[PDB]
């Protein structure tokens, strides 16, 4: 009964955490924000349409200058666009055609991508010859690359389908830190604005908070019912939002250690593929499987608007750093800039 | 603004050079058909691959009648397939290899393949993808049924009241006991496919073996039939 004794203590500790969360739940976010003004009707129009991909698009990432973005499609191409003029700056052919994620470095010098080959490949865009070549490819993951985010020109945090996140040294190609604890495929990660913590959502209906320096898990959140496909921090870094397959987006508080609000509708029965916040954080944009994107009131849980312009499943979202526009990628091989 | 004119013209020229290259890649993409190789671990995965001849994916290239095919084998992934199986929704066909002799094994490898085929057939992103079904291990199935060891009806009680279909083509020199073993297993997969087909995707079953050396011709013929019915859907304008 030694295994049962360890299970009893695990069950006893879970009740202690649940009671401590209930003791702090003196009110709700919907009660406090009851008397504020409604956001009103949000109506965005498509400003740009980016064409050139031959197959479905899985990921995109905005640049820090809010002008250039990179997109990854399963035709084996990485395309860097100029969203102001709809011009293609680079077109990188990939060794593997099953890319599932892409990242843009905050310095603008590198672009990373990965997929079913279990390898994160770094591409140098500032070569003296003028061509884009594979600067470094990182190996060591035993599952598919699902997300990756640069910390700087020398570090990058990657999630993978082997229930494990990792931190890499680009110069040496070695794993500096390994983050373990999830029991499902980690589908998304988001970096905190101070780049000292990051959250990850996996296929165990759970989200975890990690310490980059210490390599440890701090808090665990278990509000959802199905696999979490997307995650994104609040702009102030004290909260985050998750999207899942149960047709529900939720908001979690780091300091309160519990779920704050649930964003759902009776006629929505499709999963969420991507979530993102506006610059202020008042609006929460979520992409869905019914080909639409919904805008939510983050403080009132009221749907504000619909972005209906895609003929196939919306796979990725992104809001610029200055908050001017939001970009949607879909499975119809198109990118749209909404504003 | 003279330098701004040069920057826009240089950006326009670089866009024109990229679009010239993208036109060539579009022709290569159109002229090439991608396939997914899938099935249980105990079946003849290398048997199908060798008929032509750490990493997360393996690629096999072959050409039949000047038509290029890419076949992809999932190398190093976990058994939880519900997330990465969505990347193969636009392939021409999914090649599903089933060890037909493993109706009873140390457990039910055939029921695991039937449940896996049921999820692939009824997945919302795979409802337009055709499946080419290869029922392997004909010699092993013939040895098991004829010798009388084990049984099929202990794991499939409907086998006792099952008869040979009228539209059957038995190979010469085989008793009518191994033949019913093949067709009952084929009809188990066909009952799944005929329930929720709706004219979007089709299943092509074949009785492959390790010494056939002609499975590339059957894949080519079925892929030719898949493309034909995709072209027929454009004539229903309204």
């Amino acid at each position, epitope marked *: 009964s030694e295994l049962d004794q360890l299970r009893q203590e695990a069950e006893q500790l879970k009740n202690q955490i649940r009671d401590a969360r209930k003791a702090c739940a003196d009110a709700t976010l919907s009660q406090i924000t009851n008397n504020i003004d409604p956001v009103g009707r949000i109506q965005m129009r498509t400003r740009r349409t980016l064409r050139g991909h031959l197959a479905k698009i899985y990921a995109m990432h905005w640049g820090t200058d809010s002008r250039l973005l990179v997109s990854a499609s399963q035709d084996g191409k990485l395309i860097i666009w100029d969203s102001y003029t709809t011009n293609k700056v680079h077109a990188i052919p990939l060794r593997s055609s099953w890319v599932m994620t892409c990242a843009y470095a905050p310095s603008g010098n590198y672009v990373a991508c990965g997929g079913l080959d279990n390898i994160c490949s770094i591409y140098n865009l500032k070569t003296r010859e003028g061509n884009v070549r594979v600067s470094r490819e990182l190996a060591g993951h035993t599952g598919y690359l699902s997300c990756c985010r640069f910390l700087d020109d020398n570090q990058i945090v990657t999630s993978s389908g082997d229930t494990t996140c990792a931190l890499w040294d680009i110069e040496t190609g070695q794993q500096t830190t390994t983050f373990t604890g999830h029991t499902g495929d980690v589908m998304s990660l988001s970096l905190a604005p101070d780049t000292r913590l990051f959250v990850s959502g996996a296929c*165990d209906a759970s989200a975890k908070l990690w310490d980059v320096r210490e390599g440890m898990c701090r808090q665990t959140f278990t509000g959802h019912e199905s696999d979490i496909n997307a995650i994104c921090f609040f702009p102030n870094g004290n909260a985050f939002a998750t999207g899942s397959d149960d047709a529900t987006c939720r908001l979690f508080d780091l300091r309160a250690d519990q779920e704050l609000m649930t964003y759902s509708h009776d006629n929505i029965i499709c999963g969420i593929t991507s979530v993102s916040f506006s610059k202020s954080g008042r609006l929460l944009l979520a992409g869905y499987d019914d080909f639409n994107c919904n805008v939510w009131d983050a403080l009132k849980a009221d749907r504000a608007g619909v972005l209906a312009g895609h003929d196939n499943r919306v796979s990725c979202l992104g809001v610029t750093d200055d908050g001017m526009a939001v970009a949607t990628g879909s499975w119809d091989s198109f990118l749209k800039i909404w504003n | 603004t003279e330098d701004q004119r040069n920057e826009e013209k240089a950006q326009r020229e670089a866009n024109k050079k990229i679009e010239k290259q993208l036109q060539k890649d579009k022709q290569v993409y159109r002229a090439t058909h991608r396939l997914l190789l899938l099935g249980a671990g105990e079946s003849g995965k290398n048997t199908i691959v060798k008929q032509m001849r750490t990493s997360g994916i393996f690629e096999t290239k072959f050409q039949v009648d000047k038509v290029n095919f890419h076949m992809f084998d999932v190398g190093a992934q976990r058994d939880e397939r519900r997330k990465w199986i969505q990347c193969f929704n636009d392939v021409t066909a999914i090649i599903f290899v089933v060890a037909s002799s493993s109706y009873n094994m140390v*457990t039910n490898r055939l029921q695991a393949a039937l449940k896996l085929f049921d999820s692939i057939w009824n997945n919302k992103w795979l409802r337009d993808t055709s499946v080419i079904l290869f029922l392997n291990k004909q010699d092993l199935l013939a040895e098991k049924v004829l010798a009388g060891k084990s049984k099929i009806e202990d*794991y499939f009680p409907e086998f006792a009241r099952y008869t040979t279909p009228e539209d059957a083509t038995p190979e010469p020199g085989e008793d009518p006991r191994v033949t019913r073993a093949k067709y009952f297993i084929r009809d188990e997969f066909l009952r799944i496919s005929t329930a929720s087909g709706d004219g979007r995707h089709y299943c092509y079953p074949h009785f492959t073996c390790a010494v056939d050396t002609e499975n590339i011709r059957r894949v080519f013929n079925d892929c030719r039939d898949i493309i034909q019915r995709m072209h027929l859907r454009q004539y229903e304008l309204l």
Partner: nanobody
Amino acid sequence: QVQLQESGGGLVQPGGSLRLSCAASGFTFSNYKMNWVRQAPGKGLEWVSDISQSGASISYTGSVKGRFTISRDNAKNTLYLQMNSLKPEDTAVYYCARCPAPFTRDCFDVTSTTYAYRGQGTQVTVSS
């Protein structure tokens, strides 16, 4: 937090009957398809039976058809499996497994090891 708790297993003589229960919490029980799976002491995980969201769509594996009966109670979030005329090869750890997504026809990774939406299981022993 999604949680599944099984009960009702135990030692039983050959030809005996056992009723298994699966208390569910943390999710809407009526929106999901439910499964029963078992793991033999030497073999791997094997699918046993399933029932749809509202019932009326029941399938068993070949070895248990006509002897096992799966039942659902959406009002109380309980899943049942009525075992009748048990055999010594039924000795396994029976798990109550939930399909990953609601309003779906397919259930992919139910029998896959390290599955998140599966319970701890109960031991069923058939011996004399």
